[PDB]
Design an enzyme around this catalytic site. Structure first.
Site, PDB file in Angstrom:
ATOM      1  N   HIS A 146       0.807  -1.239   0.000  1.00  0.00           N
ATOM      2  CA  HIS A 146       0.000   0.000   0.000  1.00  0.00           C
ATOM      3  C   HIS A 146       0.824   1.266   0.000  1.00  0.00           C
ATOM      4  CE1 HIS A 146       0.114   0.347   4.575  1.00  0.00           C
ATOM      5  NE2 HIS A 146       0.120   1.627   4.215  1.00  0.00           N
ATOM      6  N   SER A 179       4.234   2.137   8.301  1.00  0.00           N
ATOM      7  CA  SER A 179       3.839   1.098   7.356  1.00  0.00           C
ATOM      8  C   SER A 179       5.021   0.613   6.552  1.00  0.00           C
ATOM      9  CB  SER A 179       2.787   1.584   6.356  1.00  0.00           C
ATOM     10  OG  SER A 179       1.546   1.782   7.025  1.00  0.00           O
ATOM     11  N   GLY A 180       5.048  -0.704   6.329  1.00  0.00           N
ATOM     12  CA  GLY A 180       6.155  -1.299   5.582  1.00  0.00           C
ATOM     13  C   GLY A 180       7.297  -1.797   6.456  1.00  0.00           C
ATOM     14  N   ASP A 208      -0.751  -7.305   1.667  1.00  0.00           N
ATOM     15  CA  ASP A 208      -0.036  -6.044   1.769  1.00  0.00           C
ATOM     16  C   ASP A 208       1.468  -6.232   1.934  1.00  0.00           C
ATOM     17  OD1 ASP A 208       0.320  -3.330   1.834  1.00  0.00           O
ATOM     18  OD2 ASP A 208      -0.522  -3.030   3.854  1.00  0.00           O
TER      19      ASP A 208
HETATM   20  N1  7ZM Z   1      -1.238   0.279  13.058  1.00  0.00           N
HETATM   21  C1  7ZM Z   1      -1.171   1.055  11.840  1.00  0.00           C
HETATM   22  C2  7ZM Z   1      -0.019   1.048  11.071  1.00  0.00           C
HETATM   23  C3  7ZM Z   1       0.048   1.774   9.924  1.00  0.00           C
HETATM   24  C4  7ZM Z   1      -1.031   2.590   9.535  1.00  0.00           C
HETATM   25  N2  7ZM Z   1      -1.004   3.283   8.287  1.00  0.00           N
HETATM   26  C5  7ZM Z   1      -1.767   4.381   8.004  1.00  0.00           C
HETATM   27  O1  7ZM Z   1      -2.602   4.778   8.835  1.00  0.00           O
HETATM   28  C6  7ZM Z   1      -1.657   5.037   6.678  1.00  0.00           C
HETATM   29  C7  7ZM Z   1      -2.520   6.017   6.152  1.00  0.00           C
HETATM   30  N3  7ZM Z   1      -2.079   6.322   4.950  1.00  0.00           N
HETATM   31  N4  7ZM Z   1      -0.939   5.535   4.619  1.00  0.00           N
HETATM   32  C8  7ZM Z   1      -0.241   5.542   3.446  1.00  0.00           C
HETATM   33  C9  7ZM Z   1      -0.934   5.607   2.230  1.00  0.00           C
HETATM   34  C10 7ZM Z   1      -0.221   5.615   1.025  1.00  0.00           C
HETATM   35  C11 7ZM Z   1       1.168   5.560   1.047  1.00  0.00           C
HETATM   36  C12 7ZM Z   1       1.860   5.478   2.271  1.00  0.00           C
HETATM   37  C13 7ZM Z   1       1.158   5.453   3.445  1.00  0.00           C
HETATM   38  C14 7ZM Z   1      -0.671   4.771   5.691  1.00  0.00           C
HETATM   39  O2  7ZM Z   1       0.347   3.895   5.762  1.00  0.00           O
HETATM   40  C15 7ZM Z   1      -2.181   2.548  10.340  1.00  0.00           C
HETATM   41  N5  7ZM Z   1      -2.211   1.831  11.454  1.00  0.00           N
END
Ligand code: 7ZM
Ligand code: CA
Ligand code: CL
Ligand code: CL
Ligand code: CL
Lengths: 58, 249
Positions: free
Chosen positions: B41, B187-188, B90
């Site tokens: 994502h 994330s990632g 993901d």
């Molecule tokens: N526990 C937990 C971990 C991670 C997240 N992530 C997010 O909330 C979020 C929101 N937008 N993006 C994103 C969208 C596109 C490209 C890069 C990032 C995210 O990664 C939420 N909860």
């Protein structure tokens, strides 16, 4: 021994074989000791080890 | 990361920072000198693939100390089953344009064998999650790398204790009291599991109801489902065009 129980006694990876046989294996950058279970690094920066802590305890 | 602590410099040496046009995008995990695992994502909104950079050996984003190593990203490989804007499958495998040089500050996390991961690692209760993401929900991101110890839940338990669509390609970990979680910006990144003196990759920071939202846990991609998919791709030759969608399984 069996891999599903206590990892077959292996430090890392475990394969079951036909019979009461088991073979442990190690990731690249490690070699298997003569005990048949333990893995020891063969390179300076093996995966999954933290150099500053390995030296702190060396 | 909410409710964690600074990861002492060099103690999370597999952590990757992904940048697009110099801006923080996501985290990742180094698994060997040319390969990084991240979340699919993270790439949903990329327009110019040539502006993606991976940084290894990073710690404090405010300064350059000479341990950082930056590389261009040559390939971003995503499973055919991943649908942009959703949560399932993901995962992304990134090929660097040039290998990083392993040092005391740059070391890969081991990608375990599937059997070992399913039979053994999946039962280690606590694992570490790290990143430069938000320190609080709706808060600023971190300047120093943060790390948090989170306990894993069997999916039936996560569903029972929550108050979510958790597939066999995911797992829950963390806390339902709103105090500790991974968050936007993480994330990632890695969910790393220790077993008998070595650390392994078990999860990828993926999604959550907000961050540290009371009644909810963090959701992580279940890396064990993708070991053979990853290993096969790492044995393959690169293809022109950064993005590659590869069949899964
Ligand atoms: N526990 C937990 C971990 C991670 C997240 N992530 C997010 O909330 C979020 C929101 N937008 N993006 C994103 C969208 C596109 C490209 C890069 C990032 C995210 O990664 C939420 N909860
Ligand atoms: Ca720095
Ligand atoms: Cl490069
Ligand atoms: Cl090929
Ligand atoms: Cl391209």
């Amino acid at each position: 021994l069996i891999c599903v129980n206590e990892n077959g006694g292996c430090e890392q990876y475990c394969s079951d074989h036909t019979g009461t046989k088991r073979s442990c294996r190690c990731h690249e950058g490690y070699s298997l000791l003569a005990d048949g279970v333990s893995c020891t690094p063969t390179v300076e920066y093996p995966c999954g080890k933290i150099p500053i802590l390995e030296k702190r305890n060396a | 990361i909410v409710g964690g602590k600074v990861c002492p410099k060099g103690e999370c040496p597999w952590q990757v920072l992904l940048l697009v046009n110099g801006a923080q995008l996501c985290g990742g995990t180094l698994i060997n000198t040319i390969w990084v695992v991240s979340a699919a994502h993270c790439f949903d909104k990329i327009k110019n693939w040539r502006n993606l950079i991976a940084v290894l050996g990073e710690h404090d984003l405010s300064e350059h100390d000479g341990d950082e190593q930056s590389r261009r990203v040559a390939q971003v490989i995503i499973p055919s089953t991943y649908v942009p804007g959703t949560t399932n499958h993901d995962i992304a495998l990134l090929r660097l344009h040039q290998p990083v040089v392993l040092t005391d500050h740059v070391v890969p996390l081991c990608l375990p064998e599937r059997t070992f991961s399913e039979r053994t690692l999946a039962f280690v209760r606590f694992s570490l999650v790290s990143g430069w993401g938000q320190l609080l929900d709706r808060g600023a991101t971190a300047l120093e790398l943060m790390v948090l110890n989170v306990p894993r839940l069997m999916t039936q338990d996560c569903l029972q204790q929550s108050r979510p669509n958790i597939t066999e390609y995911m797992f829950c970990a963390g806390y339902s009291d709103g105090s500790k979680d991974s968050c936007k910006g993480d994330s990632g990144g890695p969910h790393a599991t220790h077993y008998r003196g070595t650390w392994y990759l078990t999860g990828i920071v993926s999604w959550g109801q907000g961050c540290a939202t009371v009644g909810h846990f963090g959701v992580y991609t279940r890396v064990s489902q993708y070991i053979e998919w990853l290993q096969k791709l790492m044995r393959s030759e690169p293809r022109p065009g950064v993005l590659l969608r590869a069949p899964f399984p």
